[PDB]
Amino acid sequence: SMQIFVKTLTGKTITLEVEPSDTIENVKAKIQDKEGIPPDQQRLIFAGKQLEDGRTLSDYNIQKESTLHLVLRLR
């Protein structure tokens, strides 16, 4: 029910449509859908904190139009 932004280290901004009840893993799956990046290679960061897969956006009180950061990880 809200828009968020996901900024990559190359400077690209990805816009996403999410609900506060979406888990971080759900958000990663939306990123895979839109951009192609496998979820297990994504770190999502907000205000310097790595967001944990099983928690929700609401669990971090991330409100509408916030900017997350995407950093790739090696598996």
Partner: protein
């Protein structure tokens, strides 16, 4: 082409090498405080 580290909020100017910047960011997952 300014770049921002999402972990420590340092900013990196346009001419700062992209790959070195990315390596900086990744190193925070080895050690949070780099100075």
């Amino acid at each position: 082409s300014w770049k921002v580290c999402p972990m420590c909020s340092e900013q990196f100017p346009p001419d700062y090498d992209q790959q070195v910047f990315e390596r900086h960011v990744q190193t925070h997952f080895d050690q949070n405080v780099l100075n």
